[PDB]
């Protein structure tokens, strides 16, 4: 019953779901910035994949999954959610979810907007910044080669990339079947080391 009352207070007047107005109040009550890492973890746990929305089922299944029926109960889980997201297999799952989440399927697109990709990459790696992440994100904001978005395979293979190479770049082969964007980046990153 507490869960029903909790849902009802953020729920949309018309739809059977939490939309943006509720989502914002919901994060406010959690005392959490709406764009911060714990909120990504929550969306992950609730299996949302549509930004700024929790359907009735996602909210109920997600609250049940973390054993909370209250604002205070959810907050109490945060530290263990943070811990969970650090385990190797959970992280891979959170990482795959993060692409789908950032993806506007309402249109819908098949690629992430460059800037969402940049924000989500920063967010998802919160607890574990790989050596190559700072420059990779500098490279993308500059966007030397004018890409429109980030596809599912580029997102997918980026994780392995971060594990294979750097800080040295000694394990990078231009000959390897990496998405070509990775090569564009390695060049760009060689140039900036020069100009440095």
């Amino acid at each position: 019953q507490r869960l029903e009352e909790l849902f009802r207070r953020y729920k949309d007047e018309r739809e059977d779901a939490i939309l943006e107005e509720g989502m914002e109040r919901f994060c406010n009550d959690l005392c959490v910035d709406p764009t911060e890492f714990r909120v990504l973890l929550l969306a992950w746990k609730f299996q949302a994949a549509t930004m700024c929305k929790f359907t009735r089922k996602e909210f109920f299944d997600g609250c049940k999954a973390i054993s909370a029926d209250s604002i205070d109960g959810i907050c109490a889980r945060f530290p263990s959610l943070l811990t969970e997201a650090k385990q190797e297999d959970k992280f891979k799952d959170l990482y795959r979810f993060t692409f789908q989440f950032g993806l506007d399927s309402e249109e819908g697109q098949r690629s992430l907007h460059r800037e969402i990709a940049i924000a989500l990459w920063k967010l998802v790696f919160t607890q574990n910044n790989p050596p190559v992440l700072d420059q990779w994100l500098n490279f993308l904001t500059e966007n030397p080669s004018g890409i429109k978005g980030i596809s599912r395979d580029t997102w997918n293979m980026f994780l392995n990339f971060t594990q294979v190479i750097g800080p040295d770049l000694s394990n990078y082969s231009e000959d390897e079947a990496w998405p070509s964007l990775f090569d564009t980046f390695v060049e760009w990153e060689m140039e900036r080391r020069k100009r440095e």
Partner: peptide
């Protein structure tokens, strides 16, 4: 919720 701010405007 990266798109929340835009969606609220």
């Amino acid at each position: 919720m990266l798109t929340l701010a835009s969606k609220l405007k």
